[PDB]
């Protein structure tokens, strides 16, 4: 029961070939949005290449392999994963023509090795230094978001993404791994995305309007319960006699009473005036009784907040997370410069913003709570990973398949290693790249050959990375428009494509396994 030799290579090429179709209509902004109901029956709206592979049901070994390598690329850049598949497919196609005439797989592979070294050095030549200014971050931000959503909604998400990265310089990280808290708001339109500097809280107080503007906020984030009702428990289960359970109910309620009292003593010790407020965020309930008492003192107490809110507060605010209340100095408690409560939709979200010592920004996406609000979540996700790269590298090139024609031109002309063995894979490598620009033209409705001869000639005359204006599907200078690509995007399509190709190319048997 075996597919050997020609039969083994045949299976891989056929699969790559059907797949390629799908993920070209995800490529750049001119690609098309996709939904799954084929993954589980429920309604997902997604426009990323890696993600779409996970959501579906993949049984084919070649599709699965491409999805695995995809996973690594998706973490680092989150862009170019729409591209990964396209370059793989064509790369195989080239190989196939030669094999069918009469060619060995191994000579193909050698010329891939030669191909890869030259191609990577080309990145280094051609790279253009950029600043680290806002303007330059706007253009990595806008083009990457433009991939993953529309042009209309993408321009709104552009603002939110860029201010966050500027704030992350202040912490002096050269990376991003915080300021990625995505919080959702309840709304009747999605054409707003708001930036909130500090944190946002899922639920607020159950009693409205305690003091919904806090001038001077001293945040105690706690998580012990100040509500546990009147239920008869013992160790949290029923016991044989009524009375034994009851005795514990008294002491438990009594414990809660003293902890609510510590909020009353804490306000004098830290505050002392109502010229200052006091913030409580409890991830567990608080009695309706306890809120009225706190409220008149000029304390806002929040109930039913999450564990994710708590960890974030402790970083940004400089707060603490304690399993007790007690009488604590303001030295221990974090401070936020401002607190405001903004009610919109059917759920009201207390904002705790202008934190001192931040390290977390929240990008607050408004939306109707459809799959569209999940669509801007995953657009925004990979737009953060994009502008992260700009901070990583120093150099960002103009894209839109500008880079890729330039690199292909460099290979066709000379042998990179000066041997004929290398040369057979090298042709194959160069034409594989050309898929990315030509196909933006194809989506739009502009013949593919016409853009290749033009785009390539204008490189030769100038020394400009001339690109594609997506909408016409005709060439234009990708630099001015803002269609740009990071060093990391064009590096990671190159590495993934080579490694994945050479293990499928070098099959000679596929034999089933339990």
């Amino acid at each position: 029961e075996v597919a050997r030799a020609q039969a083994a290579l045949a299976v891989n090429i056929s699969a790559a070939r059907g797949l390629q179709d799908v993920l070209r209509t995800n490529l750049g902004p001119k690609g098309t949005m996709k939904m799954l109901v084929s993954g589980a029956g429920d309604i997902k709206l997604t426009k990323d290449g890696n993600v779409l592979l996970h959501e579906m049901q993949i049984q084919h070994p070649t599709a699965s392999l491409i999805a695995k390598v995809a996973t690594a690329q998706d973490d680092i850049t989150g862009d170019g994963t729409t591209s990964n598949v396209l370059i793989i497919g064509e790369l195989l196609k080239q190989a196939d023509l030669y094999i069918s005439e009469g060619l060995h797989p191994r000579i193909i592979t050698e010329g891939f090795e030669a191909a890869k070294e030259k191609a990577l050095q080309f990145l280094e030549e051609v790279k253009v230094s950029r600043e680290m200014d806002r303007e330059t971050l706007i253009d990595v931000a806008r083009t990457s978001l433009r991939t993953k959503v529309h042009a209309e909604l993408a321009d709104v998400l552009t603002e939110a993404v860029v201010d966050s990265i500027l704030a992350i310089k202040k912490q002096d990280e050269p990376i991003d791994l915080f300021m990625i808290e995505i919080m959702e708001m309840k709304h009747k339109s999605e054409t707003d995305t708001s930036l909130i500097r500090g944190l946002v809280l899922d639920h607020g107080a159950r009693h409205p309007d305690m003091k919904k503007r806090v001038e001077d906020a001293y945040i105690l984030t706690c998580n012990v319960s100040l509500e546990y009702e009147k239920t008869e428990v013992n160790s949290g289960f029923f016991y044989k006699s009524a009375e034994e359970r009851e005795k514990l109910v008294k002491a438990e309620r009594k414990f809660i009473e003293d902890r609510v009292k510590k909020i009353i003593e804490l306000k004098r010790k830290v505050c002392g005036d109502s010229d200052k407020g006091f913030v409580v965020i409890n991830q567990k309930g608080i009695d309706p009784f306890s809120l009225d008492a706190l409220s008149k003192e000029g304390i806002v107490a929040l109930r039913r907040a999450k564990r994710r809110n708590m960890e974030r507060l402790t970083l940004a605010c400089g707060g603490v997370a304690l399993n007790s209340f007690d009488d604590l100095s303001p030295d221990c408690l974090g401070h936020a410069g401002l607190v405001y409560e903004y009610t919109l939709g059917e759920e009201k979200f207390t904002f705790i913003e202008k934190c001192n010592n931040p390290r977390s920004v929240t990008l607050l996406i408004k939306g109707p709570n459809k799959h569209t609000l999940t669509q801007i979540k995953d657009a925004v996700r990979d737009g953060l990973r994009a502008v992260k790269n700009a901070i990583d590298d120093g150099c960002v090139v103009p894209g839109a398949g500008a880079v890729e024609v330039a690199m292909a031109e460099a290979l066709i002309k000379h042998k990179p290693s000066v041997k004929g063995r290398a040369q057979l894979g090298v042709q194959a490598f160069a034409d594989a790249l050309l898929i990315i620009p030509k196909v933006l033209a194809q989506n739009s409705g502009f013949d593919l050959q016409e853009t290749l001869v033009k785009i390539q000639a204008e490189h030769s005359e100038s020394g400009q990375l001339v690109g594609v204006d997506l909408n016409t599907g005709e060439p234009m200078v990708a630099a001015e428009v803002g269609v740009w690509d990071n060093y990391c995007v064009k590096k990671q399509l190159l590495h993934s494509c080579t490694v994945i190709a050479t293990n499928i190319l070098l099959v000679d048997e596929i034999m089933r396994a339990g």
Partner: protein
């Protein structure tokens, strides 16, 4: 496929052809709908009754489709259902019509992505010329004729036989308690079916209507706050039975004595706490009744699920299971509690007088509950069209009289712009033409005649057609001056959401 992975049910041939043909079938239930019609669609679902509707929301939710393209638009229709009333049908026919026109473009050699682009453009130009099609508007909301003209269009879309009485009735019974300028409530107005009597015998009552009969004495106090309990009586003690009758004779004595003394305490706790109207969804025993006569509490025999639901939303109530005495926490905003018979059946009447959080009820009287379910669609859309949150609602010509106007402007505009975009812009004109086609089909004559003769009269902003004989042959009727008007906001969200829905679904191929 070529793959034993990468699952799709759409894509290639099936995106282009199969998706469109499916949208077309959903939207066939709205090419018999929207404005003048005599269509009725019966749908069953094992609800122990027949459900008659000419509303898109109930048709759509019933009907399940296994494709994302057809399934996605149902959500857009619901969205327009929340923000506004009638025009729900118009949202689905538009998206569905545009998609039929789209597939023809794909055939010729035009690409998907420019066509997608040209709709966003056409939608923006159509909205921009839309507040310039205002021809009439309200200024007073306490005046019954200016409100009723608006209402009328919602009702019309249902049946063309019940337009006159109802459109007057809702405005008479008030949906003008709120200022409707920042704030409006629609769960503090319900449509309450009273079985019995004719549907021209449908009446005005102010504040909460519950069908269930009143027992005991009736209150008229202003200390009457509502307490709601799903089941506060079931017998305070349940029997076990050992002689398979009772367990047994001396014990039966005690089971009754303990019920009567526990119910005394429970019903006296209600009396004391300031709850002087108790809603019982349980069972009124003699013992329970005997107590409530002494304390002076209006007693509501029974409730069903539907009756409990309206108490929890309006009151700020909870419906607690009970057999151990409780106290107030349901509270209420209702002072007065009166008693008045509607339908010759004893009905419990709640009222208080205020603007915000104030209550009203469009209450109906009907031969059967089926006849009342359709009427209800007309009425609930008539409350949801009221919501605009202004007092100048900027009324634009209802009934599909705007549609031809939009179509003429858009086709000319298309010519001016170059490239592939324009063809989508032209198609965008002919999607509006869907509405004049459906009115023609019920009217009894072909499409060619109506669209041409509306175009012939040029810019009018009144022209639309009915079910009549006037609606057929000269194909000219005045639906500006018949007082057929709809709101600017209702047409806005209808066109907006529909263009957004048509673009996302045309993109799919997975």
């Amino acid at each position: 496929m070529l793959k034993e992975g990468a699952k799709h049910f759409s894509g290639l041939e099936e995106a282009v052809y199969r998706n469109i043909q499916a949208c077309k079938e959903l939207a066939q239930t709205t090419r018999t709908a929207y404005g003048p019609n005599g269509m009725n669609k019966m749908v069953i679902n094992h609800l122990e009754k027949l459900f008659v509707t000419n509303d898109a929301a109930t048709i759509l939710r019933e009907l399940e489709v296994q494709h994302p393209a057809a399934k996605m638009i149902v959500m857009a229709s619901h969205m327009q259902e929340q923000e506004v009333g009638d025009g729900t049908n118009f949202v689905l026919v538009f998206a569905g019509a545009l998609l039929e026109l789209a597939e023809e473009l794909l055939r010729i050699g035009l690409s998907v992505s420019e066509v997608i682009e040209g709709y966003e453009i056409a939608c923006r130009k159509a909205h921009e010329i839309l507040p310039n099609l205002v021809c009439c508007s309200a200024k007073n909301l306490r005046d019954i004729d200016e409100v009723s003209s608006l209402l009328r269009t919602s009702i019309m879309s249902k049946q063309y036989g019940n337009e006159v009485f109802l459109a007057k009735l809702i405005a008479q019974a008030c949906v003008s308690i709120f200022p409707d300028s920042g704030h409006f409530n629609v769960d503090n107005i319900r449509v309450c079916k009273i079985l019995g009597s004719g549907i021209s015998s449908s009446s005005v009552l102010h504040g909460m209507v519950f069908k269930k009969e009143t027992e005991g004495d009736v209150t008229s106090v202003k200390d009457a706050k509502i307490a709601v309990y799903s089941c506060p009586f079931d017998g305070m003690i349940t029997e076990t039975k050992g002689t398979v009758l009772i367990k047994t004779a001396e014990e039966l004595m005690n089971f009754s004595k303990g019920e009567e003394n526990l119910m005394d305490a429970q019903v006296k706790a209600i009396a004391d706490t300031g709850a002087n109207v108790v809603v019982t969804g349980g069972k009124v025993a003699d013992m329970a009744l005997h107590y409530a006569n002494k304390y002076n509490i209006m007693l509501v025999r029974l409730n069903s699920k539907w009756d409990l639901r309206r108490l929890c939303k309006t009151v700020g109530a909870t419906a607690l299971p009970r057999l151990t005495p409780p106290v107030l926490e349901e509270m209420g905003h209702c002072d007065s509690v009166y008693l008045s018979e509607v339908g010759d059946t004893q009905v419990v009447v709640f009222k208080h007088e205020k603007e915000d959080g104030a209550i009203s009820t469009i209450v109906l009287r009907g031969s059967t509950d089926n006849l009342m379910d359709d009427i209800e669609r007309a009425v609930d859309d008539g409350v949801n069209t009221f919501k605009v949150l202004t007092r100048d609602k900027r009324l634009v010509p209802g009934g599909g009289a705007t549609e031809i106007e939009l179509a003429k402007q858009i086709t000319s505009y298309g010519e001016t712009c170059p490239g592939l975009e324009q063809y989508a812009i032209k198609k965008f004109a002919e999607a509006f033409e869907a509405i004049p086609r459906a009115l023609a089909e019920n009217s009894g004559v072909k499409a060619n005649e109506v669209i041409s003769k509306l175009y012939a009269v040029h810019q009018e902003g009144n022209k639309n057609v009915g079910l009549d004989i006037e609606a057929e042959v000269p194909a000219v009727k005045d639906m500006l001056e018949a007082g057929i008007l709809d709101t600017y906001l209702g047409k806005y969200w209808a066109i907006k959401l529909a263009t957004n829905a048509a673009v996302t679904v045309l993109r799919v191929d997975q």
